[PDB]
Amino acid sequence: MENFQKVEKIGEGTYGVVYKARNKLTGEVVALKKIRLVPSTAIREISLLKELNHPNIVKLLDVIHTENKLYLVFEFLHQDLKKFMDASALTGIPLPLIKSYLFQLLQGLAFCHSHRVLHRDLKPQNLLINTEGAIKLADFGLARAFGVPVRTYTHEVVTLWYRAPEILLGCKYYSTAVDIWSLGCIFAEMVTRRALFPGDSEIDQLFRIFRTLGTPDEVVWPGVTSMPDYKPSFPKWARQDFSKVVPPLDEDGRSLLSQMLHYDPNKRISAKAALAHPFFQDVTKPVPHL
Numbered sequence: 001m002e003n004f005q006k007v008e009k010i011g012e013g014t015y016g017v018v019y020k021a022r023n024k025l026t027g028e029v030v031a032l033k034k035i036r037l038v039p040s041t042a043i044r045e046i047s048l049l050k051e052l053n054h055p056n057i058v059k060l061l062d063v064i065h066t067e068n069k070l071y072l073v074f075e076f077l078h079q080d081l082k083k084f085m086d087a088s089a090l091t092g093i094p095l096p097l098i099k100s101y102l103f104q105l106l107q108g109l110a111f112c113h114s115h116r117v118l119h120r121d122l123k124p125q126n127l128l129i130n131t132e133g134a135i136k137l138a139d140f141g142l143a144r145a146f147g148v149p150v151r152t153y154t155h156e157v158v159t160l161w162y163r164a165p166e167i168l169l170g171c172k173y174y175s176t177a178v179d180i181w182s183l184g185c186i187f188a189e190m191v192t193r194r195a196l197f198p199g200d201s202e203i204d205q206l207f208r209i210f211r212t213l214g215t216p217d218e219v220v221w222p223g224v225t226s227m228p229d230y231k232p233s234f235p236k237w238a239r240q241d242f243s244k245v246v247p248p249l250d251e252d253g254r255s256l257l258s259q260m261l262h263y264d265p266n267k268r269i270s271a272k273a274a275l276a277h278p279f280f281q282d283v284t285k286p287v288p289h290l
C-alpha cells in the first residue's frame, strides 16, 4: 500500500475503509479499499472480478494481497448518488436524468447478471457519477466474494431499505432479481426524493413493504408461506396504488416500477427485459450540474 499516498477518507463501507489515494508513482488517482477481514477462496473470486469491464461498473484496477492484507484499488469517481440526491432535494432530479441513470444502471446489471455476478447490497452510496452524465455500480461481486454481514466496521446500522423481500424472509439461494428490487427502490427514491421503504429493523422493513404492496400470499407468490422466516401471524394489509406511492411519475415509469417490485422473484423483470420497456423509448444522456 506504500505505492499509494492517502488524500482523504471517502467513507467507511461494508468491507472496511475507503480512501481517495494517489499512486505515489503513476500520479493516478484511485479509490483504495483496505479490506477488513486472507482466505484463498476470496482471493480467486476477487481476481475473477478484475476481468469484469463495462462502462457502468466501477473498474477494479488492482488487487493487492500484501503482508496478509487485502487492498482493492478502484477507478475513482467524484460523487455518489446519495450526495447528488441530497444536493437536489429542493428542485428534484429532472426526469430525463433519472431515466438516463436508470437505463445505464440496468445496463450494468444486465452485464453482471449475464455473468452470474450479483451485487446483493445496492444503495445510492454505491452508485457513482461523473461530469459526463455516466453512473456506475460499485462493489459488484464483493458480497459473494467475501461473505455477507450484520452491522458494519463503522459499527453502523447497514441498509435494509433496499433489501428484496426474499432475502428478508430468509431465502438462502436468491438470484439476480434481488438487484432489480434494490434498483426499483432507488428509482422510486430519485422520483419522490424520499426513501421508498425506510425500515428501522428487519420486520419493520418487511412490514413497510407489506403496507404499500400488500401482504404477499400464495396467489401472488407461490411458495411464500413456506419460506424460512414467514409467519402465518403476519398482519394482512392491502396493496396500495402506485399513483399514490410515486405520485408524479408517468404510467410508463410506474408500470416499469411495478415489474421491478414484483414479490415473486421469477415474475420480477430481468435487467435485460427492463431495457426494452416502453419507459425508455425516449431515453437520452443529459449531463448533471455537479
Ligand SMILES: NS(=O)(=O)c1ccc(-c2ccc(/C=C3\SC(=O)NC3=O)o2)cc1
Pocket (backbone or CB within 6 Å): 010, 011, 013, 018, 031, 033, 074, 075, 076, 077, 078, 079, 080, 081, 083, 084, 125, 126, 128, 138, 139
Ligand atoms: N460522498 S461523495 O459524494 O463525496 C463520494 C463518495 C464515494 C466516492 C467514491 C469514489 C470511488 C469510490 C469507491 C467505492 S464506493 C464503495 O462503496 N466502494 C468503493 O470501492 O467511492 C467519491 C465521492
